[PDB]
Scaffold this active site. Sequence first.
Site, PDB file in Angstrom:
ATOM      1  N   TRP A  73      51.399  36.441  43.144  1.00 50.09           N
ATOM      2  CA  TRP A  73      49.989  36.754  43.335  1.00 50.09           C
ATOM      3  C   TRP A  73      49.077  35.854  42.512  1.00 50.09           C
ATOM      4  CZ3 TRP A  73      48.205  39.570  47.165  1.00 50.09           C
ATOM      5  CH2 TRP A  73      46.868  40.001  47.141  1.00 50.09           C
TER       6      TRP A  73
ATOM      7  N   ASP B 258      48.236  30.840  47.027  1.00 55.10           N
ATOM      8  CA  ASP B 258      48.143  30.580  48.451  1.00 55.10           C
ATOM      9  C   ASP B 258      47.128  29.466  48.748  1.00 55.10           C
ATOM     10  OD1 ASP B 258      46.156  32.492  47.662  1.00 55.10           O
ATOM     11  OD2 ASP B 258      45.929  33.161  49.746  1.00 55.10           O
TER      12      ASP B 258
ATOM     13  N   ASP C 124      42.881  44.896  21.282  1.00 59.96           N
ATOM     14  CA  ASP C 124      43.349  44.157  20.123  1.00 59.96           C
ATOM     15  C   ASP C 124      42.499  44.572  18.928  1.00 59.96           C
ATOM     16  OD1 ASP C 124      44.813  42.422  18.597  1.00 59.96           O
ATOM     17  OD2 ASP C 124      44.285  40.614  19.762  1.00 59.96           O
TER      18      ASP C 124
ATOM     19  N   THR D 292      51.489  37.674  25.170  1.00 55.25           N
ATOM     20  CA  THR D 292      51.784  38.977  24.602  1.00 55.25           C
ATOM     21  C   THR D 292      51.745  40.051  25.683  1.00 55.25           C
ATOM     22  OG1 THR D 292      50.846  38.338  22.467  1.00 55.25           O
ATOM     23  CG2 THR D 292      51.120  40.698  22.905  1.00 55.25           C
TER      24      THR D 292
ATOM     25  N   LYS E 116      55.712  37.711  35.478  1.00 59.29           N
ATOM     26  CA  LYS E 116      54.525  37.703  34.624  1.00 59.29           C
ATOM     27  C   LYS E 116      54.800  37.337  33.176  1.00 59.29           C
ATOM     28  CE  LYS E 116      50.415  40.542  33.830  1.00 59.29           C
ATOM     29  NZ  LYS E 116      49.822  41.889  34.045  1.00 59.29           N
ATOM     30  N   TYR E 117      55.764  38.001  32.555  1.00 51.59           N
ATOM     31  CA  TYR E 117      56.066  37.717  31.161  1.00 51.59           C
ATOM     32  C   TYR E 117      57.443  37.104  31.017  1.00 51.59           C
ATOM     33  CZ  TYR E 117      51.888  40.368  30.139  1.00 51.59           C
ATOM     34  OH  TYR E 117      50.591  40.825  30.089  1.00 51.59           O
TER      35      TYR E 117
ATOM     36  N   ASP F 206      37.699  39.934  64.627  1.00 49.59           N
ATOM     37  CA  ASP F 206      37.621  39.027  63.495  1.00 49.59           C
ATOM     38  C   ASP F 206      37.957  37.640  64.003  1.00 49.59           C
ATOM     39  OD1 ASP F 206      38.137  37.452  61.174  1.00 49.59           O
ATOM     40  OD2 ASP F 206      38.484  39.318  60.043  1.00 49.59           O
TER      41      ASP F 206
ATOM     42  N   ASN G 278      44.885  31.311  38.873  1.00 47.17           N
ATOM     43  CA  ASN G 278      45.196  30.600  40.100  1.00 47.17           C
ATOM     44  C   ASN G 278      45.349  31.546  41.282  1.00 47.17           C
ATOM     45  OD1 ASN G 278      47.558  28.939  41.863  1.00 47.17           O
ATOM     46  ND2 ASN G 278      46.024  27.621  40.867  1.00 47.17           N
TER      47      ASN G 278
ATOM     48  N   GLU H  55      40.301  29.037  47.809  1.00 52.59           N
ATOM     49  CA  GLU H  55      40.589  29.192  49.226  1.00 52.59           C
ATOM     50  C   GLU H  55      39.627  28.368  50.087  1.00 52.59           C
ATOM     51  OE1 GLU H  55      41.123  33.311  50.931  1.00 52.59           O
ATOM     52  OE2 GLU H  55      39.020  33.002  51.477  1.00 52.59           O
TER      53      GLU H  55
HETATM   54  O1  LIG Z   1      42.690  37.849  24.057  1.00 51.49           O
HETATM   55  C1  LIG Z   1      43.378  37.569  22.887  1.00 51.49           C
HETATM   56  C2  LIG Z   1      44.853  37.593  23.160  1.00 51.49           C
HETATM   57  O2  LIG Z   1      45.076  37.177  24.455  1.00 51.49           O
HETATM   58  C3  LIG Z   1      46.409  37.368  24.779  1.00 51.49           C
HETATM   59  O3  LIG Z   1      46.694  37.474  26.190  1.00 51.49           O
HETATM   60  C4  LIG Z   1      46.412  38.319  27.237  1.00 51.49           C
HETATM   61  C5  LIG Z   1      44.996  38.121  27.701  1.00 51.49           C
HETATM   62  O4  LIG Z   1      44.101  38.552  26.741  1.00 51.49           O
HETATM   63  C6  LIG Z   1      44.767  38.890  28.962  1.00 51.49           C
HETATM   64  O5  LIG Z   1      43.538  38.577  29.510  1.00 51.49           O
HETATM   65  C7  LIG Z   1      45.851  38.565  29.932  1.00 51.49           C
HETATM   66  O6  LIG Z   1      45.548  39.287  31.142  1.00 51.49           O
HETATM   67  C8  LIG Z   1      45.745  39.158  32.499  1.00 51.49           C
HETATM   68  C9  LIG Z   1      46.263  40.438  33.071  1.00 51.49           C
HETATM   69  O7  LIG Z   1      47.454  40.774  32.452  1.00 51.49           O
HETATM   70  C10 LIG Z   1      46.423  40.275  34.555  1.00 51.49           C
HETATM   71  O8  LIG Z   1      46.776  41.479  35.138  1.00 51.49           O
HETATM   72  C11 LIG Z   1      45.125  39.801  35.113  1.00 51.49           C
HETATM   73  O9  LIG Z   1      45.289  39.655  36.542  1.00 51.49           O
HETATM   74  C12 LIG Z   1      44.317  39.533  37.524  1.00 51.49           C
HETATM   75  C13 LIG Z   1      43.581  38.216  37.452  1.00 51.49           C
HETATM   76  O10 LIG Z   1      42.847  38.085  36.286  1.00 51.49           O
HETATM   77  C14 LIG Z   1      42.628  38.096  38.604  1.00 51.49           C
HETATM   78  O11 LIG Z   1      42.059  36.836  38.628  1.00 51.49           O
HETATM   79  C15 LIG Z   1      43.350  38.364  39.882  1.00 51.49           C
HETATM   80  O12 LIG Z   1      42.641  37.881  41.049  1.00 51.49           O
HETATM   81  C16 LIG Z   1      43.120  37.641  42.324  1.00 51.49           C
HETATM   82  C17 LIG Z   1      42.458  38.514  43.354  1.00 51.49           C
HETATM   83  O13 LIG Z   1      43.015  39.777  43.307  1.00 51.49           O
HETATM   84  C18 LIG Z   1      42.688  37.983  44.731  1.00 51.49           C
HETATM   85  O14 LIG Z   1      41.989  38.728  45.668  1.00 51.49           O
HETATM   86  C19 LIG Z   1      42.295  36.545  44.761  1.00 51.49           C
HETATM   87  O15 LIG Z   1      42.455  36.037  46.037  1.00 51.49           O
HETATM   88  O16 LIG Z   1      43.127  35.842  43.918  1.00 51.49           O
HETATM   89  C20 LIG Z   1      42.976  36.174  42.587  1.00 51.49           C
HETATM   90  C21 LIG Z   1      44.092  35.511  41.840  1.00 51.49           C
HETATM   91  O17 LIG Z   1      43.681  34.277  41.381  1.00 51.49           O
HETATM   92  O18 LIG Z   1      43.950  39.614  39.844  1.00 51.49           O
HETATM   93  C22 LIG Z   1      44.944  39.662  38.885  1.00 51.49           C
HETATM   94  C23 LIG Z   1      45.763  40.921  39.033  1.00 51.49           C
HETATM   95  O19 LIG Z   1      44.987  42.043  39.272  1.00 51.49           O
HETATM   96  O20 LIG Z   1      44.734  38.618  34.508  1.00 51.49           O
HETATM   97  C24 LIG Z   1      44.460  38.813  33.178  1.00 51.49           C
HETATM   98  C25 LIG Z   1      43.862  37.558  32.619  1.00 51.49           C
HETATM   99  O21 LIG Z   1      43.011  36.985  33.551  1.00 51.49           O
HETATM  100  O22 LIG Z   1      47.083  38.881  29.400  1.00 51.49           O
HETATM  101  C26 LIG Z   1      47.360  38.026  28.360  1.00 51.49           C
HETATM  102  C27 LIG Z   1      48.784  38.218  27.933  1.00 51.49           C
HETATM  103  O23 LIG Z   1      49.190  39.511  28.233  1.00 51.49           O
HETATM  104  C28 LIG Z   1      47.262  36.430  23.985  1.00 51.49           C
HETATM  105  O24 LIG Z   1      48.601  36.556  24.325  1.00 51.49           O
HETATM  106  C29 LIG Z   1      47.065  36.700  22.529  1.00 51.49           C
HETATM  107  O25 LIG Z   1      47.750  35.728  21.823  1.00 51.49           O
HETATM  108  C30 LIG Z   1      45.592  36.697  22.209  1.00 51.49           C
HETATM  109  O26 LIG Z   1      45.352  37.120  20.916  1.00 51.49           O
HETATM  110  O1  LIG Z   2      41.939  39.184  50.504  1.00 52.83           O
HETATM  111  C1  LIG Z   2      42.359  38.463  51.610  1.00 52.83           C
HETATM  112  C2  LIG Z   2      41.170  37.838  52.269  1.00 52.83           C
HETATM  113  O2  LIG Z   2      40.265  38.837  52.506  1.00 52.83           O
HETATM  114  C3  LIG Z   2      39.254  38.359  53.314  1.00 52.83           C
HETATM  115  O3  LIG Z   2      38.372  39.389  53.792  1.00 52.83           O
HETATM  116  C4  LIG Z   2      38.761  40.240  54.795  1.00 52.83           C
HETATM  117  C5  LIG Z   2      39.104  41.599  54.228  1.00 52.83           C
HETATM  118  O4  LIG Z   2      40.369  41.615  53.670  1.00 52.83           O
HETATM  119  C6  LIG Z   2      39.054  42.660  55.280  1.00 52.83           C
HETATM  120  O5  LIG Z   2      39.146  43.913  54.700  1.00 52.83           O
HETATM  121  C7  LIG Z   2      37.762  42.493  55.997  1.00 52.83           C
HETATM  122  O6  LIG Z   2      37.541  43.541  56.859  1.00 52.83           O
HETATM  123  O7  LIG Z   2      37.832  41.299  56.679  1.00 52.83           O
HETATM  124  C8  LIG Z   2      37.605  40.308  55.746  1.00 52.83           C
HETATM  125  C9  LIG Z   2      37.345  38.966  56.381  1.00 52.83           C
HETATM  126  O8  LIG Z   2      37.880  38.898  57.655  1.00 52.83           O
HETATM  127  C10 LIG Z   2      38.415  37.360  52.592  1.00 52.83           C
HETATM  128  O9  LIG Z   2      37.519  36.824  53.494  1.00 52.83           O
HETATM  129  C11 LIG Z   2      39.271  36.269  52.036  1.00 52.83           C
HETATM  130  O10 LIG Z   2      38.544  35.565  51.096  1.00 52.83           O
HETATM  131  C12 LIG Z   2      40.511  36.813  51.392  1.00 52.83           C
HETATM  132  O11 LIG Z   2      41.382  35.775  51.149  1.00 52.83           O
END
Ligand SMILES: OC[C@H]1O[C@@H](O[C@H]2[C@H](O)[C@@H](O)[C@H](O[C@H]3[C@H](O)[C@@H](O)[C@H](O[C@H]4[C@H](O)[C@@H](O)[C@H](O[C@H]5[C@H](O)[C@@H](O)[C@H](O)O[C@@H]5CO)O[C@@H]4CO)O[C@@H]3CO)O[C@@H]2CO)[C@H](O)[C@@H](O)[C@@H]1O
Ligand SMILES: OC[C@H]1O[C@@H](O[C@H]2[C@H](O)[C@@H](O)[C@H](O)O[C@@H]2CO)[C@H](O)[C@@H](O)[C@@H]1O
Length: 633
Positions: free
Chosen positions: A294, A226, A212, A109, A270-271, A489, A223, A54
């Site tokens: 997401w 947005d 596992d 998986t 997702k899958y 804000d 990723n 971001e």
């Molecule tokens: O490990 C051996 C085995 O791996 C197999 O595959 C699995 C793998 O192990 C798992 O890690 C993978 O899991 C993913 C989850 O299912 C998924 O929910 C999760 O999601 C997260 C994400 O990691 C996280 O970055 C994310 O962040 C966001 C924030 O919420 C936002 O505020 C921000 O702005 O943006 C980021 C997004 O970038 O939140 C999400 C959701 O909560 O990610 C996990 C992995 O990172 O699942 C795999 C398959 O199911 C493999 O298949 C086997 O072969 C192997 O043996």
């Molecule tokens: O997750 C979306 C966005 O959140 C940002 O922070 C906010 C937060 O959501 C809110 O609860 C708080 O009171 O305000 C802050 C900032 O104004 C965060 O800055 C971003 O990285 C993110 O994309």
Amino acid sequence: PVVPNNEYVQHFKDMYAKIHNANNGYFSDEGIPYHAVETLMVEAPDYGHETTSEAFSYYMWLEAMNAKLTGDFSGFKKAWDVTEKYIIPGETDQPSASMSNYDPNKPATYAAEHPDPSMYPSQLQFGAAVGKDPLYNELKSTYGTSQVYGMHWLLDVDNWYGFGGATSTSPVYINTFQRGVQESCWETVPQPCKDEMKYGGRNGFLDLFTGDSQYATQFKYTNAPDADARAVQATYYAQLAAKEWGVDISSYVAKSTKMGDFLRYSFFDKYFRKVGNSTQAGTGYDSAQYLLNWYYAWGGGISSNWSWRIGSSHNHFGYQNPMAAWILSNTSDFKPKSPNAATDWNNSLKRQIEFYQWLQSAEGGIAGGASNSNGGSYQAWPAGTRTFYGMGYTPHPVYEDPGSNEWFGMQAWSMQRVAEYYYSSKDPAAKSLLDKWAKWACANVQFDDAAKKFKIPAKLVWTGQPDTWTGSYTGNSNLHVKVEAYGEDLGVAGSLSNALSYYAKALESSTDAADKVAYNTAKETSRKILDYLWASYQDDKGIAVTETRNDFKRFNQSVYIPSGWTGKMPNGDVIQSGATFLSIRSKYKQDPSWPNVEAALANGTGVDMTYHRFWGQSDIAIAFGTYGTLFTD
Ligand SMILES: OC[C@H]1O[C@@H](O[C@H]2[C@H](O)[C@@H](O)[C@H](O[C@H]3[C@H](O)[C@@H](O)[C@H](O[C@H]4[C@H](O)[C@@H](O)[C@H](O[C@H]5[C@H](O)[C@@H](O)[C@H](O)O[C@@H]5CO)O[C@@H]4CO)O[C@@H]3CO)O[C@@H]2CO)[C@H](O)[C@@H](O)[C@@H]1O
Ligand SMILES: OC[C@H]1O[C@@H](O[C@H]2[C@H](O)[C@@H](O)[C@H](O)O[C@@H]2CO)[C@H](O)[C@@H](O)[C@@H]1O
Ligand SMILES: [Ca+2]
Ligand SMILES: [Ca+2]
């Protein structure tokens, strides 16, 4: 090329100067923008000198505006160079041998998501259905590699957690969120994206999250769609400027289109389950949701060669970007190299605009989003679930602690893109969407003209549900938003100004009387926001004001650790049952803001902080530049 000369352009130039001034501390040694100048900061990143994809996209955007106004594109090129170097995983981050061993017929998986962190690790179910990945082969053919060109969302810029070792300040890929809908930023256990089991417990951090029978060293990246979309939007603005100034930035255009090409993974369940029939494995594009979801994520082996990829079944209106989609599908300069890419993006563009319309409340605010996976485990939808192309309505996509649509910022960030898209394309499908939204937004900006200050919505509360989408807006009489609290804000205020500027400019060509009224209101509201920001909220580092953080009581938030599970952070902090946000982040007690925080917690007060967020200062600067370029009054 006669560039505008008014006070708003100058405000931009002054802000730009502040952000790039070394005294103010916005950038690391690598030239990487921090999430914020201040280190003690928790809200999505959990440390102020982490950064996000971001922030990189905002950096690109800021430099694009500067190039538009000055003709100097060096800063923009620099922004892309640092992006590619530090936040897009390279060879040592995502080994080609693993990526090349991908199986598009078995992308990943299945594992269920769960309503509470205490239910993790989640068991891999090897017999459960997983659909086909229809993008991999085309991308591999096009780029001659199996590696993914997308930004990972979170970077530990100065190795604060120490996952990079005891004597390094080079950036480290890290992740936090892993344990579902109820894992707030206070409830995570930070982990390295490359889990080589050097830190954590016996299996690194892996068996906190996934179940596992054995565990191997591995990488995993996630990723934030947005942000990558914002990168495309920014680079487009830069390209308009480049043609205006006669400068060649084609290779950077090529970077953005490549990124946009991979960004198509954000279209998928997702899958790769069928959309609207999610118990079934998909056979290709039948698992395409066609929104910006997401996340997409990808990972694989270090000690051996294997890999996996997932999309996300969840979609939030706040992530959408019709401007980016339009750029990728309906301009020649940004047609991506993959044969099907422009078409896919065109389908996504139409779908996104429908999505905004479907979610627009009676009052005008945009409601949360929709999912192809009820409970994140493909549970049956309750009778009467309201749907959008088979996906069920979700007021708060992905997260409920707090609700991911409680924050007003999503409204500004996302509608700014609609406004810019509408100004650029004049797509009639966006007009009423914007009209209704703008009125609501303007009705909720509270000006104090005497003080030259204002408040905008801070927290939103939602009730009800939209009518199921049948192709046209219904007014959604039973879908409601209330503003529960107002605040200052300023970054969001900047974004709001930006949106209102583009909306007004887009209405400028209308001869309809009501449109002329809306034009005046939006334009005047934007101008007043900018004027009051400039008049009343400047400080040495940029434009900022105190905010109260009552949520910082969660520094003592209990973090779930499975019984019998033990581990350590790089600095030696013990990880076991009874852990807290603070107990596994003891370096926070070394922070200069800490005495104030602990004092506040001691006497049950909220914590007052004044923040300079890079994205916030950037949105404000860009709002100045936008108003200054669109309205040469
Ligand atoms: O490990 C051996 C085995 O791996 C197999 O595959 C699995 C793998 O192990 C798992 O890690 C993978 O899991 C993913 C989850 O299912 C998924 O929910 C999760 O999601 C997260 C994400 O990691 C996280 O970055 C994310 O962040 C966001 C924030 O919420 C936002 O505020 C921000 O702005 O943006 C980021 C997004 O970038 O939140 C999400 C959701 O909560 O990610 C996990 C992995 O990172 O699942 C795999 C398959 O199911 C493999 O298949 C086997 O072969 C192997 O043996
Ligand atoms: O997750 C979306 C966005 O959140 C940002 O922070 C906010 C937060 O959501 C809110 O609860 C708080 O009171 O305000 C802050 C900032 O104004 C965060 O800055 C971003 O990285 C993110 O994309
Ligand atoms: Ca560094
Ligand atoms: Ca919780």
